[PDB]
Amino acid sequence: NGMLYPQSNDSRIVFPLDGVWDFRTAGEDSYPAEWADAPLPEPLPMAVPGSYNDQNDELNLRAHYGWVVYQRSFAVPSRLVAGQRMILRFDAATHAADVYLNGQLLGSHFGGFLPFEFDVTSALHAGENLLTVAVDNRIGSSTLPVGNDAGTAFMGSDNANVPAVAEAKKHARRQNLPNFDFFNFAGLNRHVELYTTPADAYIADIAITTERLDHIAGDACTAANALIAYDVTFGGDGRQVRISILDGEGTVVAGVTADIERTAKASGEIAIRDAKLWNPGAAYLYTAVAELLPSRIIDAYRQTFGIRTVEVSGTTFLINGKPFYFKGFGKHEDSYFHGRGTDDVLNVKDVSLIHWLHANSFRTSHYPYAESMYDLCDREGIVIIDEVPAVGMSWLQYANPLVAERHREAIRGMIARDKNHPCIVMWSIANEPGLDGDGERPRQAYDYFRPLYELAHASDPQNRPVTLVCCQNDYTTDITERTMDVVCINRYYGWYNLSGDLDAACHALNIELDFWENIGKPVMFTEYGADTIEGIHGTHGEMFSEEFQRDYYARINAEIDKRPWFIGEQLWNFADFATFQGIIRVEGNRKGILTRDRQPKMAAHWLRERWAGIPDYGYK
Amino acid sequence: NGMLYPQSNDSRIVFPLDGVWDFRTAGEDSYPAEWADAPLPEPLPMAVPGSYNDQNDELNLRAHYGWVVYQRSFAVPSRLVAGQRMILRFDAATHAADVYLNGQLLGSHFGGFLPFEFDVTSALHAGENLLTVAVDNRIGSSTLPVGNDAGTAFMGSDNANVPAVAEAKKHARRQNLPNFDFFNFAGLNRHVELYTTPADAYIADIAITTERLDHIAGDACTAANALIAYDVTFGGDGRQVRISILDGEGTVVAGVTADIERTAKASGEIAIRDAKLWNPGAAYLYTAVAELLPSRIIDAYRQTFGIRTVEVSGTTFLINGKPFYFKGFGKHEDSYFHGRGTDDVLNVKDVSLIHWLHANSFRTSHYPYAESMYDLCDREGIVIIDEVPAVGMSWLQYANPLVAERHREAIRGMIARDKNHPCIVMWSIANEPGLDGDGERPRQAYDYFRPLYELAHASDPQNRPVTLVCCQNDYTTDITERTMDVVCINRYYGWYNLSGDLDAACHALNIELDFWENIGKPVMFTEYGADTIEGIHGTHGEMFSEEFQRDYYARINAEIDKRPWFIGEQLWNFADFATFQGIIRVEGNRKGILTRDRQPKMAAHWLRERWAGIPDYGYK
Numbered sequence A, B: 001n002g003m004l005y006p007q008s009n010d011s012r013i014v015f016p017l018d019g020v021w022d023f024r025t026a027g028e029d030s031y032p033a034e035w036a037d038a039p040l041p042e043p044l045p046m047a048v049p050g051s052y053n054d055q056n057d058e059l060n061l062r063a064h065y066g067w068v069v070y071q072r073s074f075a076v077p078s079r080l081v082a083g084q085r086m087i088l089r090f091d092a093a094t095h096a097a098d099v100y101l102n103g104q105l106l107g108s109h110f111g112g113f114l115p116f117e118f119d120v121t122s123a124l125h126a127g128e129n130l131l132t133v134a135v136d137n138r139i140g141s142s143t144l145p146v147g148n149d150a151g152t153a154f155m156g157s158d159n160a161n162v163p164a165v166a167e168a169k170k171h172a173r174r175q176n177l178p179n180f181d182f183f184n185f186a187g188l189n190r191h192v193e194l195y196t197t198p199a200d201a202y203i204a205d206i207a208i209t210t211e212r213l214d215h216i217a218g219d220a221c222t223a224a225n226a227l228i229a230y231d232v233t234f235g236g237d238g239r240q241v242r243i244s245i246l247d248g249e250g251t252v253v254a255g256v257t258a259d260i261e262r263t264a265k266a267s268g269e270i271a272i273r274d275a276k277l278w279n280p281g282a283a284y285l286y287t288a289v290a291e292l293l294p295s296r297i298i299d300a301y302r303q304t305f306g307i308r309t310v311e312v313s314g315t316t317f318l319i320n321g322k323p324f325y326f327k328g329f330g331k332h333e334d335s336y337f338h339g340r341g342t343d344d345v346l347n348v349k350d351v352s353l354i355h356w357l358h359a360n361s362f363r364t365s366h367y368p369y370a371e372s373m374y375d376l377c378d379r380e381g382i383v384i385i386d387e388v389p390a391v392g393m394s395w396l397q398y399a400n401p402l403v404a405e406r407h408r409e410a411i412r413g414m415i416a417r418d419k420n421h422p423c424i425v426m427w428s429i430a431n432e433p434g435l436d437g438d439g440e441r442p443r444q445a446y447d448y449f450r451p452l453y454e455l456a457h458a459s460d461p462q463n464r465p466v467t468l469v470c471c472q473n474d475y476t477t478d479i480t481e482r483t484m485d486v487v488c489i490n491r492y493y494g495w496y497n498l499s500g501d502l503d504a505a506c507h508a509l510n511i512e513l514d515f516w517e518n519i520g521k522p523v524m525f526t527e528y529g530a531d532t533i534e535g536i537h538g539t540h541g542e543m544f545s546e547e548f549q550r551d552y553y554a555r556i557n558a559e560i561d562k563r564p565w566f567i568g569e570q571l572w573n574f575a576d577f578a579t580f581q582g583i584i585r586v587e588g589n590r591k592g593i594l595t596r597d598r599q600p601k602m603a604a605h606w607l608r609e610r611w612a613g614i615p616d617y618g619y620k
C-alpha cells in the first residue's frame, strides 16, 4: 500500500531513467507486442518526464487516439544489484500502461496520475536491459477522467438537425471526447526510476500524524507539547526499528526504539516539547528517521512531516486552533512544451508567484500533482486541497461498478501517497459531478458519493475534512454537497449566465448565499472567473477584457466579505491552460489571472493588493 | 583533457544530483564562506538544472549582481563507493563557481558553458554529504562573454551631455553591463552528477575520426570502404583495450585489440567495408565500444560516432564529397522559466521544428550548448556549427592575457567535449569581434585571432574547417575574416541601415557580395533578419510587421541565389529570446521566425516552403 518516494542513503540507491527515449505511435486499440523483444524500428526521440503531444511538430500528436510505445536501454553494475530488492517505479503514466522488461511483461496499470511500481529483481540481467512501455491515452465512460463514448466534447457546438452533419459524424476520425475542460495530455508525464531496498527486510511505508497540541502559543508558532504518532510498515522475510525526530537544524530532539509485531508493523507515540508548528505562510518541517535495527543499520528512510492540526468547527476551518481563510485558486499542471509533464523549475516559479500574489493555497484541479510540488508547498507554507481525477461524472458512471472501483482506487492511492504532507488540509473526491435534478437522481448521486466520503475519512490517519467540488447547479435539489465537511462551490454568475451583467450577477449570488447561510456549513469558492485576453482593454470593460476580469472579482468578493461563514476564495484559474479546441476556447482556457507564461493580467495586480490586506488567520 | 559524458554500465554508475536545492543570494563581491560548513539559513528553493533568475518573482533576480550560493545534501550506499574513483561533475555553472563538499573547498572554475569536475573520492563520507556551490554571474572586460566595465549595455541609450545624467549614473545600483544581446542568465544551468570509474585503471578519453572514404556511392549512403581512427586515453596506475564497432543494429562489424603504451594511450585504424555514412537529413550512427582488458572486463565506455568527411574545396563545402548547402539559423538556449537552463523536452521539440521547417543546420550562438542537444542532432541528421562564448570582444580584450587564456580554455574545452559528434562540421572561434578600422587595429585583431584559428585546427583530430562570425563592418579594412576557412557574415541591410528600403538593402548587399566574389572563399549568412511582433500586419508591410519579415527574407534570398559561391543561409533567429531591457528590445529580441513559445510567424511558413525545395546536396 505504501508508496514512499524513492530515496538514496546508506541502505538504498536510486537510479533515474529520465532522459531522451525512443518512441513510436501505434494503433487505436493495439500495439505490436514484438516491439518489446527488440529495439523499436525507426524510433522518434521523446524526452521523459513529459507529455508526448507537443514534442513533435512534424506530427499532430494532439490528435492521436490509442496507443504509443516508449523504449530505452540502461545498464547498472552487478555489484549494486547483488542481494538487493530491485524496484522499477513510474511516478505517472497517462492514462494506462503495459510495462515490459527484456521481453517480459511486468504488468499493467490504469490511472494516469498516481504512481505504480514493479519488483524487477528476477527480470534484470547484466549489461544492457531493454525497457518497453506502451501507453494508452483513451478515455471514455468508464475512465477517470471521464470521456464520452459518443457525441461532443464539453461545451461543444453541434448542429445535429442537419442530415449532412449526422452522416459525416459517423465517419469522422476517432478522437477522445473529454467530459472535462483541459487537454488530454498523455505519456510518461512524470519521472521513471529504478531503486533498491534490502531484500530480507525493508521499510515499506510510514505514516506520521499530529494527534494533539497542548498550550498553543497565541501566535501559533509553537505548542508547549505536541503528541505525534508513527506507524511504520515493513516488508520482507525480536526485531526493532529506531525512530529519530530531527528538527529544522538536524538536531535529534527525540528518539525511541519500537517493537516490530506481525505485514510487520511498528507503531507508537512521541511527545515533542515546545514543538514548532507548521502554519500557512510560516512553515516548519521535522524529519522522522526510521532505522531498521539488526551499531549497523539494516534499512533507513527519512520522512518529512509538519506538526499541525486541522479541524472544522461550526462554520470555521481551524488550523492549529485558528480560524483560517483560503486565498488562492485552482491550478493545472500545464505549460507549453511539457504539457502535463512535471517541471520543477516551473513549480519553483509558481510557488514564488503564489507568494507574490499573497495567496496562501490552491487545489490540485483536477488530479493529483507531481509529488515534488507537495514537498515544495510543505517547505513554503502553502495550503493544498488534494483532488482525485474524478471529473466529468454523471449518473451513467454511478451505475458502473468498474468506475466505482477505479474511483476507490484513486482515493486510497492519493491518500496513501500524500498522507504525510502537512500542506494538505482537505481532500476532494470529485469536481463537478451531476448531483441535482428530479426523481431518484439526487438520491442516486448521494448513494454513490457517501461511501467515498467515508472511505476518504477512513483512509486518512490524520482524518482531514473531506469535500466535493460542486458545479453550478440547482442547489435546491442537490442533496449531496451540503453533507460534505466543507461546502466547495464553483460559480460563474455573470459569465456563463447573466452574461456581463455584474449587478444581476451579484443579486443572483446573494440569493444562493442566503440559501447556504441556513445550511450552517463552512463555504468557500473553489472556482469563479472570466476568460480574459491580455491586451484587450476598455474604459467600460466588456467580457474578455482585462478590466472586466478585474471588475468581476471586485464585485463578487465584495459580496462574500459580507458573509462570516464564507471561509475562502479560490478562483479559476491560476494561469491560462490548454484545452480541446472549440468556439469558447481562445487558444485554450483564458480564465487565468496569469498568462500561460505566468505574466500578470490586471486582475492579478488587483487581487494581489486585496490578498495583501487579508490575514491567513482571523479574517472572519 | 577528456570530458566524456558520464555513463552507466557494469563497471560504472552515475548518481544524478538534480532536483530542488537550497539557495540564497549573496554579495556584489563576496559570500559567507561559513555557509559551506552548515545548512543554509532561511534558504529559498531553486530547481537544478535551470537559471535562477526567473525562478523567484518575489525577488528581482534578473537585477542581481554578484554571488549566489546553492546547496543540497546527498547520501549513497558505502558499498557502491567502495574501491571506486568518485567524480563530481558540473555540466555547467554560469559563469564562475566555488565548489565545497562537507566544508572542504574542492576548487573553482571559470567558464559558464562548459563542464568541469572534481575528484571527491577522499572528500566523501558515509551518511549525508553537504554540497555547497557558490556561483558568480559577474561579467566584465576580462570575461567571456564580454561585459562592459562602465557605460551602457549592447545598443544602450544615453544622454551623457546632461550633467544630471552623468551624476546619477555614478550613484546607480551596480549592474552587469553586457556587450552582447542576450540576457545574462546565471546559475546551475546544466546537470550536476556524481559518477564512478575503476580506480586502478580507467578510460579517460576517446577520440574517433573518419580518415578516408573509398569509392563513395552516388547517393553517399555508403562508401566501399571507410578507414576510421581511434585514440583512447587512460588514467590511473602489456595492457590491452578491445575496440568493437557496433552498427545501428548492434551487430559487431569490426573489432581490433590494441596495445596500451604509456599518458597511457592506445591508437590505431579500423577498416569498415560498405560503411554506412552520416549525412544531413539521413543520419547513421555506429558505436565504438572500448573495453579495458585485465574474459573479464576492467572498464568500458560506449562512444557514439558517425562516419563522414568534411572538406572545404575552393568555394564548396563538401560533406562526403558532395556540395552541401546550409539551411538554418542561429539559435539560443532560451525559454520562459528555465532561462538558459537545459530542457530536453524543448530540445526534442526544437529538433522537430527544424525538420518541420526543412532546415538542415544551426549554429550554437553564442556558446556551446548542452551536450544532449548534439546527441539529439547526431541521430536526427542536423548539421551544427559549434561556437565558443567569445562574444562582445574588442581591442581592449586582445591586449588582456587573462582573456586570451580564457579564450584558449574555451576553444580547447569545446573541442575536447564535442570532437566525436558527426553533426558538428565547423568551429566558430568568435561572434562579431572588432576586426576593422584604421591604423594598427586590423593587424592587432589578426594577430589575436590567427593563433586561435591555428589552435582550433590543432585541437580537432577531424580537422574540420574553422570560422569566425563577422559583424557588419568595413569589410575593406577587415583583414581577418577573409582568412577563415569559411566566411561567415552577419548582415542587416534593410534593418539596422537603409531601414525599410528593400531595394536599397539589396543594392548594398550586392555591392558587398561583389567584394566577396573576388576573395574566392565560400561565403554564408550566419545572421540576417528583422524584429517582428506576431499579430502586427500590413498590406504593405513595415518594420515589425509579420509581412515585412517575410518580404525581407524573400528579397535577400533572391539575391544570394544568384551567387554560386554562396553556400548557406543561417538566419537570426530561430525563436524570440530574452535580452537586457532597452528601447529596441520589445520583451527581448523579436527576430525569431518563431515566437518564444515556438509558434510560427508568417516568415516561418514562407521559409518552410522555400527550404522544402532546396536539397541538402547540389543546390549550387
Ligand SMILES: CCCCCC[C@@H]1NC[C@@H](O)[C@H](O)[C@H]1C(=O)O
Binding pocket: A180, A181, A182, A366, A432, A471, A472, A490, A491, A492, A496, A527, A572, A589, A591
Ligand atoms: C456554469 C456552468 C458550468 C461552468 C463550468 C466551469 C468549468 N469547471 C471545471 C473547470 O475544469 C473548467 O475549466 C471550468 C471552465 O469552463 O472554465
Ligand SMILES: CCCCCC[C@@H]1NC[C@@H](O)[C@H](O)[C@H]1C(=O)O
Binding pocket: B180, B181, B182, B366, B432, B471, B472, B490, B491, B492, B496, B497, B527, B572, B589, B591
Ligand atoms: C548592423 C550591425 C549590428 C548588427 C548586430 C546584430 C546582432 N548580432 C549578434 C546577435 O547576438 C544579436 O542578437 C543581433 C541583434 O542585434 O539582433
